[PDB]
Write an enzyme that holds these catalytic residues in place. Structure first.
Site, PDB file in Angstrom:
ATOM      1  N   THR B 259       0.830  -1.201   0.000  1.00  0.00           N
ATOM      2  CA  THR B 259       0.000   0.000   0.000  1.00  0.00           C
ATOM      3  C   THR B 259       0.863   1.248   0.000  1.00  0.00           C
ATOM      4  OG1 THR B 259      -0.108  -0.132   2.406  1.00  0.00           O
ATOM      5  CG2 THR B 259      -1.899  -1.152   1.169  1.00  0.00           C
ATOM      6  N   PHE B 384      -7.795   5.482   4.217  1.00  0.00           N
ATOM      7  CA  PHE B 384      -7.344   4.704   5.363  1.00  0.00           C
ATOM      8  C   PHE B 384      -8.497   4.068   6.133  1.00  0.00           C
ATOM      9  CE2 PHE B 384      -3.825   7.744   4.681  1.00  0.00           C
ATOM     10  CZ  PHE B 384      -2.782   6.836   4.527  1.00  0.00           C
ATOM     11  N   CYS B 391      -7.097   2.535   9.448  1.00  0.00           N
ATOM     12  CA  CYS B 391      -5.714   2.094   9.360  1.00  0.00           C
ATOM     13  C   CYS B 391      -4.924   2.542  10.583  1.00  0.00           C
ATOM     14  CB  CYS B 391      -5.073   2.655   8.083  1.00  0.00           C
ATOM     15  SG  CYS B 391      -3.327   2.253   7.930  1.00  0.00           S
TER      16      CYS B 391
HETATM   17  C1  HEM Z   1      -0.603   4.376   2.080  1.00  0.00           C
HETATM   18  C2  HEM Z   1      -0.498   3.243   2.779  1.00  0.00           C
HETATM   19  C3  HEM Z   1      -1.701   2.535   3.448  1.00  0.00           C
HETATM   20  C4  HEM Z   1      -2.993   2.512   3.090  1.00  0.00           C
HETATM   21  C5  HEM Z   1      -3.663   3.188   1.870  1.00  0.00           C
HETATM   22  C6  HEM Z   1      -3.716   1.705   4.058  1.00  0.00           C
HETATM   23  C7  HEM Z   1      -5.067   1.427   4.042  1.00  0.00           C
HETATM   24  C8  HEM Z   1      -5.795   0.781   5.016  1.00  0.00           C
HETATM   25  C9  HEM Z   1      -7.234   0.591   5.043  1.00  0.00           C
HETATM   26  C10 HEM Z   1      -8.225   1.078   3.969  1.00  0.00           C
HETATM   27  C11 HEM Z   1      -7.544  -0.083   6.156  1.00  0.00           C
HETATM   28  C12 HEM Z   1      -8.961  -0.513   6.591  1.00  0.00           C
HETATM   29  C13 HEM Z   1      -9.234  -1.865   5.935  1.00  0.00           C
HETATM   30  C14 HEM Z   1     -10.601  -2.413   6.275  1.00  0.00           C
HETATM   31  O1  HEM Z   1     -11.448  -1.664   6.823  1.00  0.00           O
HETATM   32  O2  HEM Z   1     -10.852  -3.612   5.994  1.00  0.00           O
HETATM   33  C15 HEM Z   1      -6.312  -0.344   6.873  1.00  0.00           C
HETATM   34  C16 HEM Z   1      -6.181  -1.015   8.063  1.00  0.00           C
HETATM   35  C17 HEM Z   1      -5.000  -1.389   8.664  1.00  0.00           C
HETATM   36  N1  HEM Z   1      -3.736  -1.005   8.270  1.00  0.00           N
HETATM   37 FE1  HEM Z   1      -3.291   0.157   6.661  1.00  0.00          FE
HETATM   38  N2  HEM Z   1      -2.813   1.261   4.983  1.00  0.00           N
HETATM   39  C18 HEM Z   1      -1.571   1.748   4.658  1.00  0.00           C
HETATM   40  C19 HEM Z   1      -0.401   1.529   5.360  1.00  0.00           C
HETATM   41  C20 HEM Z   1      -0.259   0.747   6.486  1.00  0.00           C
HETATM   42  C21 HEM Z   1       0.961   0.516   7.249  1.00  0.00           C
HETATM   43  C22 HEM Z   1       2.347   1.129   6.911  1.00  0.00           C
HETATM   44  C23 HEM Z   1       0.652  -0.308   8.268  1.00  0.00           C
HETATM   45  C24 HEM Z   1       1.547  -0.906   9.384  1.00  0.00           C
HETATM   46  C25 HEM Z   1       2.753  -0.443   9.731  1.00  0.00           C
HETATM   47  C26 HEM Z   1      -0.758  -0.615   8.175  1.00  0.00           C
HETATM   48  C27 HEM Z   1      -1.452  -1.433   9.043  1.00  0.00           C
HETATM   49  C28 HEM Z   1      -2.819  -1.580   9.123  1.00  0.00           C
HETATM   50  C29 HEM Z   1      -3.551  -2.353  10.111  1.00  0.00           C
HETATM   51  C30 HEM Z   1      -2.922  -3.173  11.267  1.00  0.00           C
HETATM   52  C31 HEM Z   1      -4.857  -2.235   9.833  1.00  0.00           C
HETATM   53  C32 HEM Z   1      -6.032  -2.861  10.609  1.00  0.00           C
HETATM   54  C33 HEM Z   1      -6.387  -1.900  11.752  1.00  0.00           C
HETATM   55  C34 HEM Z   1      -7.528  -2.417  12.592  1.00  0.00           C
HETATM   56  O3  HEM Z   1      -8.573  -2.815  12.017  1.00  0.00           O
HETATM   57  O4  HEM Z   1      -7.385  -2.452  13.846  1.00  0.00           O
HETATM   58  N3  HEM Z   1      -1.278   0.041   7.080  1.00  0.00           N
HETATM   59  N4  HEM Z   1      -5.268   0.194   6.147  1.00  0.00           N
END
Ligand code: HEM
Ligand code: HEM
Lengths: 450, 446
Positions: B259, B384, B391
Site C-alpha cells: 500500500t 485509510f 488504518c
Molecule cells: C498508504 C499506505 C496505506 C494505506 C492506503 C492503508 C489502508 C488501510 C485501510 C483502507 C484499512 C482498513 C481496511 C478495512 O477496513 O478492511 C487499513 C487497516 C490497517 N492497516 Fe493500513 N494502509 C496503509 C499503510 C499501512 C501501514 C504502513 C501499516 C503498518 C505499519 C498498516 C497497518 C494496518 C492495520 C494493522 C490495519 C487494521 C487496523 C484495525 O482494524 O485495527 N497500514 N489500512
C-alpha cells in the site's frame, strides 16, 4: 532542576500578578515565557503551574497525586459545602455521594433527562424565532439562561424561567454574587471588605433557603420526578449502606448549579464563536444537524448521531476549557519528570488551556480551530486532553454537559443561519470560568417548525 | 428503491465479472454505468458496492455498520490470523491488540521510528546517486524495496537488505506468493494448496524465530516487537501472546509495504505527469530540508508534499476497498432497506471521484484540494478506512512517504523518459506497473 518563577513584588512575591481581570490568560502568557512548569509564591502559599502533557500525565497518576482544593475551591466550599466538587477525596461524604450519584450521571441516564433538556432547548429556539429583523442575540447571556434552567429542571424539577426575565431569579443573583465574592477574595482583609462579607452571608442564606425548602417540599409531597433530587432522596451508597442526608443533598444541588451552568454555557458560547469565525466548519456542522435531526423534536438517539457537532464541542473545549484549571497535591515525596523533587503535600496546578496548546502533542497549528483533530478519538494521547479533570475526581457531569451542548448546538444549527454582524473581537471575561464577553450574532430563521 | 445490478451469467450471477485481471477498475466502470450503488451477486454471496459520498457517509456510521471481513480478508486471514486487519471487532484479540498498539503508531511514536526510516531512505537515495548515465529507475520495484525494509526495521529490527538483492528475501517470496494465492482464489489446484501451506510455514518460522530470539536476548529496541513484548492492554490487563504477536508482525508486512510503496509510486507518477506540481513540491523540499539528513520536525513541515500524497491517495487509494455489515435492520439513503448482517463494499476510488464533492475536474491532479481539511465534507476521503477500524498505520505510512518523497525531490530532477502510459496492476493492492523514470542528481551530499 531549578524551577522558573515570574516577576516578584517584594514581600507579596507573585501574588499581585493575580490582581488582573484576566488571570488565566496572564498565567498562560507566563507559561509561554517560562515553559512547562513554574513556581508561584504568595504569602503562606506555594504552588507550581504545569503546562506540558509530559508533566501533567505524571500529575494525573492517582497513585502519586490526589485532588487538592485550590484557594478558589476553598472559597466556593463556603457555599458548596462538602458537595462533590469541594470535598476532599478522603472525606466520607465524597465517596458516599460519588457512589450514589454516578449511575444518575451515566450516558444511559441522559435518556431520562433528555425530555427536560428539550423543554428548555425549545424555549431557546422559540426566543430566537421570535426576534425581530435587525435585532441580535447576546450569546453567553442566552446560553446561561438555557444551561441554568436545564440544570434547575433536571436537578430538582424547578423552573427558574430565565427566558421570562431580564433580572434573573433571586437565587441566581445570590449565586452569581457569591461566586463573584469568591473570585474577588483571591485577588485581595481590611475594614472596607465588611460590606462584601455581610452580602456574602446573605447570598449563602438565600441559596440554602430555596434549596432546603424545595427538598422539604419534595419530602412532604412524596412525589417522584425524573430529576437528581428524586435519585438522591431514594439512593443508598452500596458501601456505607447510607443515603445522603438533607444538608448534603442541598450542597450537591448548589454544586450542580455552580459547577455546571457557566462551564456549559461558556462551551456553547465559544463553540458558536468558533463556528461563525470558521464558515467551512459551520457548513459541515449544519449539514449534519439537518441530516440527523429529521423530527421536529430531537430524540436521544439522534443527538448521539451528531458526531461532527461533538467534534466541534471538543475542539472548542481544547482551545478554551471553561473550567480552566485543577489542583493536585503529592501524596508522598516524589520526583516530577526526573528533575523536580516534590515533598509530601506539595501543590500542583494543571493549566488546562496551556496543556491543550502543547505543540509536542498537537503539532504546530495549536491555535487553529479544526474539529477534524477529533475525527478519530484514538489519535489523542493519554492525558493530552483534560477539559473534564482527571480520574475518580473527574467531572461527574461530563455526559450531561456534552449531551445538553450537543442537543442545543444541533438545534441551533438546524433552525438558523448565523451572521457575525459586528465582526466580533474575541474578549474572554474571567470569573472562575471563561466566556466570550459581548459576543453577539444575528440569526436568520430557516423556518423549520418545531 | 430497486437497486441496479450488472450483467449476469445464468447460475453464476455476477461472479464471472471478477474473472478479469483488473477487477477494481472493472468495478469502477460498472459504477460509472449504474451509479452510486449496485448489487453484486455470486453463488452464496450478496454484496452492494457503494460509490457516492451520500451513501458512504451513512455506511461510516459505526452505530449502524461494523467492519466485515471481505472474501479477500478471509483468505488473507489464513496467514494473517487474528492480527488487527483480519480480525472481527468482537474478537477479544482485536480490542486487546488495538489498545496495546495504538500508542506505538501515534504521531508521537513516529519520532522514535524516524532514525530507522532515514536509514532506509538514505539507501534508496544512494542507490539512485550511484546509477550510471542513461540507466533508469524501476519505480514500484524500488519503492517496495524501501517500504518493505522500513517495516522490517521499525517492526522488529530486522534487515531484509532489499537494496542488496535481485531476488527478495525468502520471507517476502512466500508472503507475495501467499497474497497471490489469496487473490486467485477469489476468481476461481492441489499444488497451489501444498504451496500455500509451505509459504505459511516459511512466514511463521522466521517470525516465530525472531520473537524467540528477541525473548532470549532480553535486548530492547525502538521497534514494534519490543512494545508488543512489554505492553499490556489497559482494559483486560493482559499482554498479547506470542502467536498473536507473530500475526501482527506478518500483518504489518502485508498491510503496510505494498500500500505504501504504491502510494509513493503513484505520487511520483502524478508528479512527473504534472511538472508545475512537481516544481512546487521540489521548491518546498529544497526550502525545508536544509540539513544533510531530514529531521522529524522537518518532515512535518513538508506540507505541500503531504498534500501531494493525499491527492495521490484520492485518485488511486492503494487499499482500494473495505467491507461493512449492517448491525441491525436499517435504511440506507432513505430508499435502500437493509437487513441485519447485509454486506456493503466501499469502492474507494469511485468515492474519490464523486463530482458532487470534488467538482467537475475530478480526474485532475491538484494537491491544492487538500489545503483545508475543514472544507472537505464528512467521509468524502477514506483512503485509510473508517472509525475504530481505520488504518492503524496511517501516521507511519504518511511519515515514511513524506520523508522519502521529500528526499527524492531534494536530491534529483526526474524525467518521464518513456512518456509512460499508466498501467495499473491489481493484486489485493494497486500499483503503476512498469513505471520507470530517469533521475539526474542535483549533487547534494548526504
Ligand atoms: C498508504 C499506505 C496505506 C494505506 C492506503 C492503508 C489502508 C488501510 C485501510 C483502507 C484499512 C482498513 C481496511 C478495512 O477496513 O478492511 C487499513 C487497516 C490497517 N492497516 Fe493500513 N494502509 C496503509 C499503510 C499501512 C501501514 C504502513 C501499516 C503498518 C505499519 C498498516 C497497518 C494496518 C492495520 C494493522 C490495519 C487494521 C487496523 C484495525 O482494524 O485495527 N497500514 N489500512
Ligand atoms: C463543559 C462543561 C463542564 C466542564 C468543562 C467541567 C469541568 C470540570 C472539571 C475540570 C472538574 C474537575 C475539577 C477539579 O479537579 O478540581 C469538574 C468536576 C465536577 N463537575 Fe464539571 N464541568 C462541566 C459541567 C458540569 C455539569 C453540567 C455538572 C453537573 C450537572 C458538573 C458537575 C461537576 C462535579 C459534581 C464535579 C466534582 C466531581 C467530583 O470531584 O467528584 N460539571 N468539572
Amino acid at each position: 532542576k531549578e524551577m522558573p518563577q515570574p516577576k516578584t513584588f517584594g514581600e507579596l512575591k507573585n501574588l499581585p500578578l493575580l490582581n488582573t481581570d484576566k488571570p488565566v490568560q496572564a498565567l498562560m502568557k507566563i507559561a509561554d515565557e517560562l515553559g512547562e512548569i513554574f513556581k508561584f509564591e504568595a504569602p503562606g502559599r506555594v504552588t507550581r503551574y504545569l503546562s506540558s502533557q509530559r508533566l501533567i500525565k505524571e500529575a494525573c497518576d492517582e497513585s502519586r497525586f490526589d485532588k487538592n482544593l485550590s484557594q478558589a475551591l476553598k472559597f466556593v466550599r463556603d457555599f458548596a459545602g462538602d458537595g462533590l466538587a469541594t470535598s476532599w477525596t478522603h472525606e466520607k461524604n465524597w465517596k458516599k455521594a460519588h457512589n450514589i450519584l454516578l449511575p444518575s450521571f451515566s450516558q444511559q441516564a441522559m435518556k431520562g433527562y433528555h425530555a427536560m433538556m428539550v423543554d428548555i432547548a425549545v424555549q431557546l429556539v422559540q426566543k430566537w424565532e421570535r426576534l425581530n429583523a435587525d435585532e441580535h442575540i447576546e450569546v453567553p447571556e442566552d446560553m446561561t439562561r438555557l444551561t441554568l434552567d436545564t440544570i434547575g429542571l433536571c436537578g430538582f424539577n424547578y423552573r427558574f424561567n430565565s427566558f421570562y426575565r431580564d433580572q434573573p431569579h433571586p437565587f441566581i443573583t445570590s449565586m452569581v454574587r457569591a461566586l463573584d465574592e469568591a473570585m474577588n477574595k483571591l485577588q485581595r482583609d481590611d475594614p472596607a471588605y465588611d460590606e462584601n462579607k455581610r452580602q456574602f452571608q446573605e447570598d449563602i442564606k438565600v441559596m440554602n433557603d430555596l434549596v432546603d425548602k424545595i427538598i422539604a417540599d419534595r419530602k412532604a409531597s412524596g412525589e417522584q420526578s425524573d430529576d437528581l433530587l428524586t435519585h438522591m432522596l431514594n439512593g443508598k451508597d452500596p458501601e456505607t449502606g447510607e443515603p445522603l442526608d438533607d444538608e448534603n443533598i442541598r450542597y450537591q444541588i448548589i454544586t450542580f448549579l455552580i459547577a455546571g451552568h457557566e462551564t456549559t454555557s461558556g462551551l456553547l458560547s465559544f463553540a458558536l464563536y468558533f463556528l461563525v469565525k470558521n464558515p467551512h466548519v459551520l457548513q459541515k456542522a449544519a449539514e449534519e444537524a439537518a441530516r440527523v435531526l429529521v423530527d421536529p423534536v430531537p430524540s436521544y438517539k439522534q443527538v448521539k448521531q451528531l458526531k461532527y457537532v461533538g467534534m466541534v464541542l471538543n475542539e472548542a473545549l481544547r482551545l478554551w476549557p471553561t473550567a480552566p484549571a485543577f489542583s493536585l497535591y503529592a501524596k508522598e515525596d516524589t520526583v516530577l519528570g526526573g528533575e523536580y523533587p516534590l515533598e509530601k503535600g506539595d501543590e500542583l496546578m494543571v493549566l488546562i488551556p496551556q496543556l491543550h496548546r502543547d505543540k509536542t502533542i498537537w503539532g504546530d497549528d495549536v491555535e487553529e480551530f479544526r474539529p477534524e483533530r477529533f475525527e478519530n478519538p484514538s489519535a489523542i494521547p493519554q492525558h493530552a486532553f483534560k477539559p473534564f479533570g482527571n480520574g475518580q475526581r473527574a467531572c461527574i457531569g461530563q455526559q450531561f454537559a456534552l449531551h445538553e451542548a450537543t442537543l442545543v448546538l444541533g438545534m441551533m444549527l438546524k433552525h438558523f443561519d448565523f451572521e457575525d454582524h459586528t465582526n466580533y473581537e474575541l474578549d474572554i471575561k474571567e470569573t472562575l470560568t471563561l466566556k466570550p464577553e459581548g459576543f453577539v450574532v444575528k440569526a436568520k430563521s430557516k423556518k423549520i417548525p418545531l
